[PDB]
């Protein structure tokens, strides 16, 4: 949902207020992805256990 997927581009493009909003969107997306990855890895780890 952000303008770009690169944090450096956002920092070099937008002001602190809008750059923060874009980085917040990117963080939300990447954190959801990482949480899903961790949950699936924990399920696989339970199976491996």
């Amino acid at each position: 949902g952000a303008i770009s997927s690169v944090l450096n581009d956002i920092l070099s493009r937008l002001d602190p207020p809008e750059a923060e909003v874009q980085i917040d969107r990117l963080i939300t997306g990447r954190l959801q992805s990482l949480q899903t990855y961790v949950t699936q890895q924990l399920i696989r780890a339970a199976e491996i256990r």
Partner: protein, 97 residues
């Protein structure tokens, strides 16, 4: 683009190609020329810091009340008929009296 004697009408807006040149927008902040200056996809002060690939300028003149509707996703008798901006448009809008 900025100081041209006569801009083209919004009905037939000139398509200006800017390339193979140094873009220096500090003149706007180095002298009080334009009353209204705003950016959506980038920062007004980081335009010089960050270098782009292909810059294009659109010049047109509209009524004062029609300026508020010149932005991504806007609608009205100007946005939806003669000149329109993409919803994901990345750029800046400049207006002056």
């Amino acid at each position: 683009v900025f100081n041209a004697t006569r801009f083209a009408s919004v009905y037939a807006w000139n398509r200006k190609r800017i390339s193979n040149c140094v873009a220096d927008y500090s003149v706007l902040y180095n002298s009080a020329s334009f009353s209204t200056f705003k950016c959506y996809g980038v920062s007004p002060t980081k335009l010089n810091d960050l270098c782009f690939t292909n810059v294009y300028a659109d010049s047109f003149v509209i009524r004062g009340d029609e300026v508020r509707q010149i932005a991504p996703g806007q609608t009205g008798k100007i946005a939806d008929y003669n000149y329109k901006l993409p919803d994901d448009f990345t750029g800046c809008v400049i207006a002056w009296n």
